[PDB]
Amino acid sequence: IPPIPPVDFAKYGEIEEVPMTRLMQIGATNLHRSWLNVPHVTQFESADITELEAFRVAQKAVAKKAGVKLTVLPLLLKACAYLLKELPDFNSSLAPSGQALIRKKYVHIGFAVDTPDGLLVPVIRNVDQKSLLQLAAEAAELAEKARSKKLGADAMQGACFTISSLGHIGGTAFTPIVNAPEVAILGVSKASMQPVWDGKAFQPRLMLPLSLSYDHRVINGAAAARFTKRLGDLLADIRAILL
Amino acid sequence: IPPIPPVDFAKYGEIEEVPMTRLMQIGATNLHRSWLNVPHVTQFESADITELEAFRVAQKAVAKKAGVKLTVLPLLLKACAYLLKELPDFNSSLAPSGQALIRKKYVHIGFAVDTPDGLLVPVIRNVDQKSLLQLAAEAAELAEKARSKKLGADAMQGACFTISSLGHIGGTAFTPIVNAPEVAILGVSKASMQPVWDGKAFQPRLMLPLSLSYDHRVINGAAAARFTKRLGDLLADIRAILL
């Protein structure tokens, strides 16, 4: 690929060189390796989380007793685990022969933690088997270890899918990058109150923005519109996971 | 381009290998070839289809008599054909010398059909010359042949532009991939009722999401904002095609 020409930046004004941590360097290399290997498409969708929210907030007692804090990440993780099992091509990877997909029969999911040294993406194993408070507890442990450079490579491995949540900072949507060899990553941005047509008038409903990027060689356009559709349906009534 | 390292996926749990149809393999190869050749930009726009819809639904009698079913795809195809003629750089391809564009004086348009064996994109020729019921009939023939593996390579050739409609499944917008050597592809997602400001109050209007990806080497940012603008104008009052 042609390089970018060097520029004497100091011709235009004062410059200063600060260097990158090896963590940044790693991160930089893996992203570019994904960018060039994966033909990327992003599917956007909004889910009605008005009831999910009200539930989150009512179980604040139970979660405080249990020592965890229930955010939207456990709810996101449980629903994606259920869907990674309904729609298995999302839970798979392209075999290196380019002629097969390796369907994984396990559901471990990673999630992005941005630490000062760089991006780390700790993996929770067997998301399909743990409960909302279990996942809430674990998510939090892994994140603190991640910030404290006390997370060990063991825990950064063999994930099937990634959730990257910027909802706590803001933004309307983004186009995340597939963390190859995985085939899809779900970006979650900030919830807003929004008018939604109820057949007769507009009701305010709390809407969560979802931005699913995928490896188009393995997932086609309709498979992906269907994944974000099912997920917005699950998040609107999480009781369907009981079914 | 550096490869992705192989991972022994079975270290993390049970895996299973299912293989790809040659159709998937083809599809995979062409997408990646586009991804690396075309610097991609996506322009988003929403069109007011409230009147187009009401028309669609009133001609249901006529279409049933004629044996076709009138969906939004014939209306999309007619308007894009008209615009591919108004704005010709969208109807062209970059000559392989990299120093010229081959402007095509014909308008054949392909459309994406997702079949079980993979993605197929049958082409309707001379869209500019056929009527809404003609295109409705033809769209449907080609799609059934496509699902039935009875579509022949003849019919997958020399298109100028592509429409990829996921509207029937859902989603808010997506970033489709230019089907090189074409220079643009129009993605259409699900229509929603939306409040639209009428200078004094918000009216509910049925809004169709449009996501136009283009080859930025041939189309610049303003040419593309102008194409989606004209198209939202045409779809708001399709009678302008008579002009």
Added chain:
Amino acid sequence: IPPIPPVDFAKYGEIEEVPMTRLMQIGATNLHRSWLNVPHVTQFESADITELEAFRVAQKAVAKKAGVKLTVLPLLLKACAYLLKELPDFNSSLAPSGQALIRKKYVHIGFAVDTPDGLLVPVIRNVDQKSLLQLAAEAAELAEKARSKKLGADAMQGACFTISSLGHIGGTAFTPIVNAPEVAILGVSKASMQPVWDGKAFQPRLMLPLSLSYDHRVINGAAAARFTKRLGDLLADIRAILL
């Protein structure tokens, strides 16, 4: 990277070859060089410009006296200059050793002008030091020289960031391409009146769409959600720049 196969386009109908200006050729080459070097992410956000607008329009007298026309571009430029100083990683470039960032202590910003010969991106130097009418005057000079092929290479150099505004043509959002070796570009599309929840009811507020693309090797997902957040905050009350 594999090439795209040549197609005898004339098998399908009449074609015509028109050639590209060297300006297009240049533009084409630089875009593709960016596309393959920069792993791109786009962050979307909307800013409430209702008060900024009303201000713009009240200073129409002053601007007419001063011979300039105050559009949104000076307001965009002043706020980005302030932020390129608050959040310095946006004002930097990746050193060619891949192991360092060159932080630039200057703020010159380029902006995209689409001329008939191709795209040109004149640079305003030391945006941080000039006032709204200064920048309004200058923006306009550079743009006319650009359209008149009277802009000289001097003026197309050593920018730190780019603003690409298609707001005057239309569109809802787009994904612009980082103009490498810069690390981010802000796309601005068309403002619309929109219902915004005020805790009790929806108020109409004039909303400006912002689409920030960045080089993910240098800027992480949260740094970028924070830049578009601060910018929507600055544009909502530009007096915070006085602080």
